[PDB]
Design a protein around this nucleic acid. Structure first.
Ligand SMILES: [Mg+2]
Ligand SMILES: [Mg+2]
Ligand SMILES: [Mg+2]
Ligand SMILES: [Mg+2]
Ligand SMILES: [Mg+2]
Ligand SMILES: [Mg+2]
Ligand SMILES: [Mg+2]
Ligand SMILES: [Mg+2]
Ligand SMILES: [Mg+2]
Ligand SMILES: [Mg+2]
Ligand SMILES: [Mg+2]
Ligand SMILES: [Mg+2]
Ligand SMILES: [Mg+2]
Ligand SMILES: [Mg+2]
Ligand SMILES: [Mg+2]
Ligand SMILES: [Mg+2]
Ligand SMILES: [Mg+2]
Ligand SMILES: [Zn+2]
Ligand SMILES: [Zn+2]
Lengths: 81, 87, 25, 217, 120, 129, 97, 206, 96
RNA sequence: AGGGGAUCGAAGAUGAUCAGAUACCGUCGUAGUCUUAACCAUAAACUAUGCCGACUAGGGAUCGGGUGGUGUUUUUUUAAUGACCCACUCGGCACCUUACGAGAAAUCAAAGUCUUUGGGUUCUGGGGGGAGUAUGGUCGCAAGGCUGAAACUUAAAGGAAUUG
């Protein structure tokens, strides 16, 4: 306060801010690869869903939508990228 | 504030905040001049020999006196850690 | 007089000049 | 016989401080008029306006008298003193002393050329007090003090030669208007013109230099 | 109500202030003191005074009384000063918090270690 | 909705000064804002600034000292006719000896003195002291 | 001029509450302005509690008080109950006692 | 300008965590404090007492710096701080003020409480608040014992402590006196654990 | 900015608006209505000459007590009838 | 204009009170009070405070959404849930303390960033009374709504704070 660095602010206080009031705005959602070991391949899923995403071959499930991040379905794995 | 031919006219060139560089005018009887003493080899405070800073009443009024002091002294050489330019 | 009874005072007053004027329409 | 209390009063009579410009430099709060008396003996007074006030009391009225005085030289030092006693001389007495104490300095300048000896102001300047805004405006030489008799006599004692003034609000209530023109010229040394952008070293406090040569007994 | 006015209490205060040695728990000599030592215009006022500078004196001897300080107190308090011999290095090791220790680690060096958790 | 984008930048700067601060993040920047920030900087009233680059309209961090009292914007860019410039600075500058009215001419955003030296005129932007 | 920030009493984000009736004088008053107290008191009283149990069946019985919420009308609230009138400051103080 | 061994030492860090000077205020937490160091959970904040040390240095580094050591003034109406200030005063120059401040002491010559100092050291700007005010009427610099919730208005140089009680204020006030002497004055070399016991300073009983 | 459009083309609004509020000025309204010429005993002119009808004895207002000695005059150019004051001690003796 | 008409209850009639008492208090109780179809368009319809945008300062609660957690409580076999807790973050209804700042003041995070006077825009006021009166227009079944003057009079009317 009174004198500080607006240009190079701490990673953490930037971290806790709203996604629109960061120094340069960016998302804070992500994508994942999801499995349900009946199948061998992996659909790519967005962290926020709206659409209850179905798998490639089997009419199984995967996740349900919510207010924000999707609730992933029961027996599943996930990596992030 | 010179004149026609050189010649320093108009008296009293005032002090100045080391925090804000605003003028520290006369009736600002709320400002302060802090003398920090110069030390030597093993303690010993060398009487009459200071590093000094002047802080406008406004600044101390706003509470910014202890943060702005930190910054001044630290980056002048008499603190290390304590202060952080970023937040 | 109470502001509102003065409003009523003249309301009547207007309705009477309303009456009286009609006499000669 | 003086006998001064306060470190600052002592250092003054002790002739260790020669001028108030010093006092102002370090903003040293005054508390003993004799300071500004020996520091500034060219001071001439002027009782600007006297008016009766009155208060009711659970047994009697009470009309004491307000008196408003302006002291100064005419070389850049003014003072605005306002005191109410139940006698006029009394109120004039205390008023002058309060006006001594209040003595602030004035920055003065050049309308617009570098010539010989400041005659006008450094900038445009406002003072407000109550509802009256007095506004002081730099003016060419020989313009004069363009102002009502009261403000003019205050600006003259102030040492100003040529200035334009403008006022707002209920000017008739003198008490606030002078207190406004006061702030108005009391504001000339808070204004950062570029010529003051120069950085000075930051002088040592007369309190520390003659530290011993002050102090109690 | 025998509540003593200010002037009586005012004067008693001042007398204790500057003539504590001389005076006593005895009005009768406190009286005689006041003659030699103070100017008063009436017998009654002197007695009314001395009796109280007495009382004031009689309860200084057991605790101070606000308002009167003959500075002998302020320095009696100075040589009445001391205590301790046991301090607060026993037993074992300065117990710290989880982060108090991280605080140590992050700036310094050696300290005896003792960690505790805590709960809601 | 957002009207003069120059307005907000100027204003934010002034309040940063008034609160005794040393920086302002301003948003959303513009050619005109830089060219203005540029003229202040040329004459001491601020430090260096920095265009940050959200892929939008931009942000600017301004570093300022305290030499500055006020930097306003003239909300309708009135036309000024080489003679009226006298009357402008006279109205909104503290003394004849310093301070600048900055404006916009066919030959660029320039303070009134460079404006007088190049002998061009145009519209009026804002001012600095 | 204005002499309360709550104005009348307790109404911000609405525009129309709804009226209740004074328990004392039946004057309508906006419920949010109402001025209310719970009249929880025992069914019996002071002395009766002994002479109660004495001439009753069951061991000490149980005892079940009465509970009714009282709405007063300012004028009524002031004329007797919770009110006094407080200084220009003590006024502000919302804390009960 | 950094000395060499005026680093925060082992014995000192030991000294502090027994007094619990790193135990800062709860939920309550004035904006003007980066003197923090990670939130201990269950509502307590830990204090970077390295800085505490480093601030204490400046405190001394300016206390000693005043041509006459007796127009340096210690204040404390906090009973916990009265036993200390008198003891800080004792060792150093310093006139003290324990108990009631009594207003009009800095303005107003006409009082018998009248002081006029070149510096102020205060243990709780909440309780001493009067003094912090009065100083600002008259160009006096102020030193302060500050917690995480203490007002920072008109105090320059904080010393981050724990006015929650116990030994800290005593400890801090002891170290103050300790270092001002290890400056220009009647002290000595390195470690120099100093004769005088820290429990000397400390509110008494019952 | 409060009210007044600051725009660079808003001249027409700005003028009209003034036009409107000039009417709240007592002298501007008087001038344009021609209250002078319409109402008002004198023609608009500075003086006017009439004939004396009766000598009156107007009693003053409070807190004054007096009889104020005036004349009802019928303006020549006008016929309009008007009561006028006859100043200074006597003078009511001059008229008839 | 139909219905409905428990209740309370303009009007009216009463019993008392009063010097009087067309009232206050008590009784009777028409219209009304509710509802459908249609009118009317006004309230201190009030936050007596236009809307959009920016900036300027601290604090604890709470309402909705979200995110984070080897948090608590729910037992079953751990979870899954839900409720709770703790930190943050948007957007709400508000209170607290300060006040750099503003005001004639009371007070005001706007009523601030205004003689250092300009982001955009709408509306209204220009001493008091006359008077929201006269008049014309217009809307309405009406009651009345909107628009809305002058002559003449007058030195104050008014606001906030103080002491009585
Ligand atoms: Mg007929
Ligand atoms: Mg006069
Ligand atoms: Mg009232
Ligand atoms: Mg409503
Ligand atoms: Mg009108
Ligand atoms: Mg006649
Ligand atoms: Mg003719
Ligand atoms: Mg019915
Ligand atoms: Mg009846
Ligand atoms: Mg009857
Ligand atoms: Mg009747
Ligand atoms: Mg209306
Ligand atoms: Mg309301
Ligand atoms: Mg807030
Ligand atoms: Mg969760
Ligand atoms: Mg009169
Ligand atoms: Mg009033
Ligand atoms: Zn699948
Ligand atoms: Zn009631």
């Amino acid at each position: 306060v009174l004198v500080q660095d607006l240009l190079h602010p701490t990673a953490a206080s930037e971290a806790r801010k709203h996604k629109l009031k960061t120094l340069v705005q960016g998302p804070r959602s992500y994508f994942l690869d999801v499995k349900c070991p009946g199948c061998l391949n992996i659909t790519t899923v967005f962290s926020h869903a709206q659409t209850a995403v179905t798998c490639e071959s089997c009419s199984t499930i995967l996740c349900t939508p919510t207010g924000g991040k999707a609730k992933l379905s029961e027996g599943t794995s996930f990596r992030r990228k | 504030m010179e004149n026609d031919k050189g010649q320093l006219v108009e008296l009293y060139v005032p002090r100045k905040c080391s925090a804000t560089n605003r003028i520290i005018k006369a009736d600002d009887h709320a400002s302060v001049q802090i003398n920090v003493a110069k030390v030597d080899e093993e303690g010993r405070a060398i009487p009459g020999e200071y590093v000094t800073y002047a802080l406008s009443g406004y600044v101390r009024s706003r509470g910014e006196s202890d943060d702005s002091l930190n910054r001044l002294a630290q980056n002048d050489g008499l603190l290390k850690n304590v202060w952080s330019y970023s937040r | 007089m109470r502001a509102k009874w003065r409003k009523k005072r003249t309301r009547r007053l207007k309705r009477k000049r309303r009456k009286v004027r009609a006499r000669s329409k | 016989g003086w006998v001064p209390v306060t470190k600052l009063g002592r250092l003054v009579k002790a002739g260790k401080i020669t001028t108030i410009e010093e006092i102002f430099l370090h903003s040293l709060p005054v508390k003993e008029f004799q300071i500004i008396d020996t520091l500034l003996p060219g001071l001439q007074d002027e009782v600007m306006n006297i008016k009766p006030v009155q208060k009711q009391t659970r047994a009697g009225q009470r009309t004491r008298f307000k008196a408003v005085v302006v002291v100064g030289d005419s070389n850049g030092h003014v003072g605005l003193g306002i005191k109410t006693a139940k006698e006029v001389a009394g109120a004039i007495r205390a008023g002058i002393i309060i006006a001594k104490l209040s003595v602030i300095p004035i920055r003065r300048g050049y309308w617009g050329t570098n010539l010989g000896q400041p005659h006008s102001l450094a900038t445009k300047t406002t003072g407000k007090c109550g509802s009256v805004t007095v506004r002081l405006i730099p003016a060419p030489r020989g313009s004069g003090i363009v102002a009502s008799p009261a403000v003019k006599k205050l600006l003259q004692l102030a040492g100003v030669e040529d200035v334009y003034t403008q006022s707002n609000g209920k000017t008739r209530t003198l008490e606030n208007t002078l207190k406004a023109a006061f702030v108005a010229i009391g504001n000339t040394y808070g204004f950062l013109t570029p010529n003051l952008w120069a950085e000075q070293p930051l002088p040592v406090s007369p309190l520390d230099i003659y530290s011993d040569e002050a102090s109690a007994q | 109500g025998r509540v003593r006015t200010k002037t009586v209490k005012r004067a008693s205060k001042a007398l204790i202030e500057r003539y504590y040695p001389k005076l006593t728990l005895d009005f009768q000599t406190n009286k005689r003191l006041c003659d030699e030592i103070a100017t008063i215009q009436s017998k009654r006022l002197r007695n009314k005074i001395a009796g109280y500078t007495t009382h004031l004196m009689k309860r200084i001897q057991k605790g101070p009384v606000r308002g009167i300080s003959f500075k002998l107190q302020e320095e009696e308090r100075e040589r009445k000063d001391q205590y301790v011999p046991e301090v607060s290095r026993s037993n074992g090791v300065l117990n710290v918090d989880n982060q108090t220790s991280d605080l140590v680690k992050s700036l310094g060096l050696k300290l005896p270690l003792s960690v505790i958790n805590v709960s809601a | 909705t957002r009207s003069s984008v120059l307005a907000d930048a100027l204003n934010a700067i002034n309040n940063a000064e008034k609160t005794g601060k040393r920086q302002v993040l301003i948003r959303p920047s513009s050619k005109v804002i830089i060219k203005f920030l540029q003229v202040m900087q040329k004459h001491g009233y601020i430090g260096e600034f920095e265009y940050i680059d959200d892929h939008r309209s931009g942000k600017i961090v301004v570093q300022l000292n305290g030499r500055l009292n006020k930097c306003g914007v003239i909300s309708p860019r009135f036309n000024v006719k080489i003679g009226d410039i006298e009357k402008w600075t006279a109205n909104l500058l503290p003394a004849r000896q310093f301070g600048y009215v900055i404006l916009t001419t066919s030959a660029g955003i320039m303070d009134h003195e460079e404006a007088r030296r190049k002998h061009v005129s145009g519209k009026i932007l804002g001012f600095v002291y | 001029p204005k002499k309360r920030a709550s104005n009348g009493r307790n109404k911000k984000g609405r525009g129309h509450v709804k009226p209740v009736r004074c328990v004392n004088c039946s004057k309508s008053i906006p419920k949010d302005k109402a001025i209310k107290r719970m009249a929880i008191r025992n069914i019996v009283e002071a002395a009766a509690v002994r002479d109660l149990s004495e001439a009753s069946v069951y061991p000490e019985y149980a005892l079940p008080k009465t509970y009714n919420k009282l709405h007063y009308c300012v004028s009524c609230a002031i004329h007797a109950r919770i009110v006094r009138v407080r200084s220009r400051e003590d006024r502000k103080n919302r804390a009960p006692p | 300008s950094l000395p060499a061994t005026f680093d925060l030492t082992p014995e000192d860090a030991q000294l502090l965590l027994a007094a619990n000077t790193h135990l800062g205020a709860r939920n309550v937490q004035v904006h003007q404090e980066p003197y923090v160091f990670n939130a201990r959970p269950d509502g307590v904040h830990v204090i970077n007492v390295g800085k505490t040390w480093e601030k204490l240095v400046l405190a001394a580094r300016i206390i000693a710096a005043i041509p006459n050591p007796e127009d340096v003034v210690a204040i404390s109406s906090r009973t916990f701080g009265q036993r200390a200030v008198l003891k800080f005063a004792a060792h150093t120059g310093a006139t003290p003020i324990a108990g009631r401040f009594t207003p009009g002491s800095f303005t107003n010559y006409i009082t018998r409480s009248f002081k006029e100092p070149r510096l102020v050291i205060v243990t709780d700007p909440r309780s001493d608040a009067q003094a912090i005010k009065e100083a600002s009427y008259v160009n006096i610099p102020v030193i302060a014992l500050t917690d995480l919730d203490s007002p920072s208005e008109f105090v320059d140089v904080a010393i981050p402590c724990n006015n929650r009680g116990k030994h800290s204020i005593g400890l801090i006030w002891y170290l103050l006196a300790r270092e001002v002497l290890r400056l220009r004055g009647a002290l000595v070399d390195r470690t120099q654990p100093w004769s005088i016991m820290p429990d000397l300073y400390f509110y008494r009983d019952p | 900015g409060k009210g007044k459009p600051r725009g660079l083309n808003s001249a027409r609004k700005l003028r009209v608006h003034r036009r409107n509020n000039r009417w709240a000025e007592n002298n501007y309204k008087k001038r344009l209505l021609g209250t002078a010429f319409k109402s008002s005993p004198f023609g608009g002119s500075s003086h006017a000459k009439g004939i004396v009808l009766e000598k009156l004895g107007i009693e003053s207002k409070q807190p004054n007590s007096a009889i104020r000695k005036c004349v009802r005059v019928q303006l020549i150019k006008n016929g309009k009838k008007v009561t006028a004051f006859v100043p200074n001690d006597g003078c009511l003796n001059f008229v008839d």
